[PDB]
RNA sequence: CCCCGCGGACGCUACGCCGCGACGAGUAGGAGGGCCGCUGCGGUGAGCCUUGAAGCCUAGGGCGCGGGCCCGGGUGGAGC
RNA sequence: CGGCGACGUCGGCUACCCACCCGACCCGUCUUGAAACACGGACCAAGGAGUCUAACACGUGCGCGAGUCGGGGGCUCGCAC
RNA sequence: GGGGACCGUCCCCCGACCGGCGACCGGCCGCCGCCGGGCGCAUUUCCACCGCGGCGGUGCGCCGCGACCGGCUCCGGGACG
RNA sequence: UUCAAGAGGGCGUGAAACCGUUAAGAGGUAAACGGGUGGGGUCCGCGCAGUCCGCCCGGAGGAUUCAACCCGGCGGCGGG
């Protein structure tokens, strides 16, 4: 089936298919400092309905 | 009751990809988080493009990308396309390009890399510019499809230049009556 | 005219309409005017920052 | 009898599927999720000598 | 990768039970036995599971080592805690918290250990 | 998959999506392209102008091989040879220009769409267009003819 | 005596009767299973007063008390002991019940294991 | 520079969970969802079953807005 | 905060029978209009009706991409699959 | 026609420097945690029981009562301008 | 006789329509139906002095041993 840097020698036109996402580690990508520097702070407070008195 | 109309309540738009591709869904998760948690509008545009269908993500050729990246002030910027980058054999000189694409044709990739360029996926683009700073967001020709030749006013109306649907093209196929003044009329 | 009854409200009418049944169109939503901050966020740029300003 | 029983798949698609299946056969979570009792297997890409 | 493998097994798995509007997952190292990314006991580089001991007393705390991810034979280290309930819970708490070893499962493991020990003490009349 | 179709959803609805008034009858309006000049005239004139009538000369026993003549444009001309050919020609100190035989690659006529790089080249073809020949000569090339 | 759930809210059922099919009273060939009337003149479909009511989404149960037994638990069907252990960490919200085709000797063991695990069984004395 | 306490609920099937606001007629017709239902095939449940399958009966217990479903008792006798 | 609690009573709005008040014309269908003095329908069981092929058009998903496609043929102990 | 030269990709090596030991791993150390065995044998620790014990959560088998708070609402008195 | 004739030669199971008998209830506006209650009946609830469990206090009892150190094993993290 070939390497990514050499085609298959027993299929005459085939090469391994390419990834559209090199690093699929979503957790590492999100925890990375470069992503975290660009974010706004979380809005983790819940604002429930106020009973109109 | 209230006096309102409900025929426009539901807005028709992609809220997610119709694709079940797990890598696409993973980078959709990534850019969904980026769009929510940053103020950048680049991330929102990229996310809504990731939702889109294939006809709404037309391929971008190497020549068109080079032409758009040669414009003044775009030096050392990352060309971002949400779609496939296609080799154009009509060009001979490939400059050094930094490129981020959803897909790259094998020949286009080899040409870009031997020209000294760099290719990134969208997770790498998120790690490189999380807000999309220093990017040129490109798009392939959306109306560069055969169906848009048939779309429009009907072929048999005056001042319409829309292609008709014919099984064959020849002097016997839809050329006589309604096409020339000698056979009835032309319009 | 056949579909409405209208007239000239007085100060007490304006007060009671705003205070008992006053709701704001905030971000396209019907939000009860339970805090002056709701008025000040939307109409503060016009000098209206409280229910008294709105009533005036 | 002429119901079009057969389908033709692109060779590139079929090769893609083979590659995906091979890649997934080397991840213990996916093999365990197919339910294959790979618990004392010393190495999931399990390779044995040619004398077999 | 955990996210990639989760996208594969989130709905197609032999451990999946979808029944009575409920969803359960029965892989060996799943605390709370729920079909979830956080609690899946197969897709992560480090997992912790609490099981009843081989005999009818104690618990087994099994944690996934770091190196042999593709070698399931040696990938899990199991230890047996056969002490009183408070010391057992303290031991599990120290395994998870002090090691910084996946601290989002600390209370799940403590509660599962409590359930196991409570099931091991004799039934009443 | 028949389980994905409207017929599964139309169970219980009496008319099966075809209306109670006009119903689903056998062939209201005719069969095939019936009445294309009588009661489907608006459709035919609107979407297929030129449908009716004869135009031009008929020719019995047309042999398409006789008129077979595929074409290639000047912007794709350099793709008929290897990359090495063009690179060596560009860096060649002498005036030696490579030969591109488009007949070998499977084209007979060379059309002149696009521009050429500034490299002399000898092009062999059965036919040329005026602008293709002009553009080949403007880069210092030559056009030779084959039969 | 019985194991009690985590919380015991008041279950409010908007409707307690079944929706019977129109004219299922007049015929044996028509079962009481609900079918939407689609006749051009049907008064049940047109919603005339005093007629058979039509099921619609407004009758939906509160999502906090939906699928909830009168005991306060939610049932989960089990066919063996291994399926029973999935409720170990859901003792106080979900109750197991043994499938109808599980043999008597095997459901005895399931009942014993559920007693050990403090899992409530809705049919604990069912083949004996 | 946390330490007499070494400790601190839940969560996040991200196709998930949460919040807020407005709204809810419908033939013909269109669309979506269906952990609605039937039969067969590939996988999977170290699934169920002569200590009793299917089917059928039932003033039995329930769940779901509903399509329907689960469980008890009986009959049945080999598969689901 | 009170009362009551095993062979008599306690709870179970669902489920069986019955009573009463209010409401309630027989469905399907064609029709501007059906409860119709319009038609079909005594009852029950089982069966019973948008399918397959070909050709187009647009939409969607996938692969490759100025290419793409082996579908016809051929090669691999000829054949449990 | 061969055999060569060159070019482009490759496959292994000899090697110096560069980023990192990484989600490719071992050895040493340092910290931490766990387990097993000793020592520790009592103001420590753990186990089960009792009190109609206190504090927390859920909640009372059934039938009921009261209180205050808040939301909505319909009324009634009194007083001021 | 048989496991079973509640398998007895058109005999596996044995639905509905329809019919006989038994039991309960009812009955001058043909029956039947929707909503709301009530009465009776059949069943269900291990109903019948009514839940558990975390900590602390007190009392009455047991037992290895609690911490800390020593040895060994195994992991997590870091290391120019
Ligand atoms: Mg409407
Ligand atoms: Mg309709
Ligand atoms: Mg008509
Ligand atoms: Mg109901
Ligand atoms: Mg009926
Ligand atoms: Mg009508
Ligand atoms: Mg409304
Ligand atoms: Mg509606
Ligand atoms: Mg009719
Ligand atoms: Mg008429
Ligand atoms: Mg009618
Ligand atoms: Mg009449
Ligand atoms: Mg008549
Ligand atoms: Mg008629
Ligand atoms: Mg008939
Ligand atoms: Mg008749
Ligand atoms: Mg039928
Ligand atoms: Mg028998
Ligand atoms: Mg018989
Ligand atoms: Mg009878």
Coordinates of N, CA and C (backbone and C1' of nucleotides) and ligand atoms in Angstrom, one line a residue, chain I residues 28-30 39, ligand 9:
Chain I
rG28 P -64.5 9.4 8.3 O5' -64.5 8.6 7.0 C5' -63.4 7.8 6.7 C4' -63.6 7.0 5.4 C3' -63.7 7.9 4.1 O3' -62.4 8.3 3.7 C1' -65.4 6.3 4.1
rU29 P -62.3 9.9 3.3 O5' -62.9 9.9 1.8 C5' -62.6 8.9 0.8 C4' -63.6 8.9 -0.3 C3' -63.8 10.3 -0.9 O3' -62.9 10.5 -1.9 C1' -65.9 9.2 -0.4
rC30 P -62.2 12.0 -2.0 O5' -63.2 12.7 -3.1 C5' -63.3 12.2 -4.4 C4' -64.6 12.6 -5.0 C3' -65.0 14.1 -5.0 O3' -64.3 14.9 -5.9 C1' -66.9 12.7 -4.6
rC39 P -78.1 6.1 -2.4 O5' -76.7 5.5 -2.7 C5' -76.3 5.1 -4.1 C4' -74.8 5.0 -4.2 C3' -74.2 4.0 -3.3 O3' -74.2 2.7 -3.9 C1' -73.1 6.0 -3.0
Ligands
LIG9 MG1 -68.1 8.8 -3.8

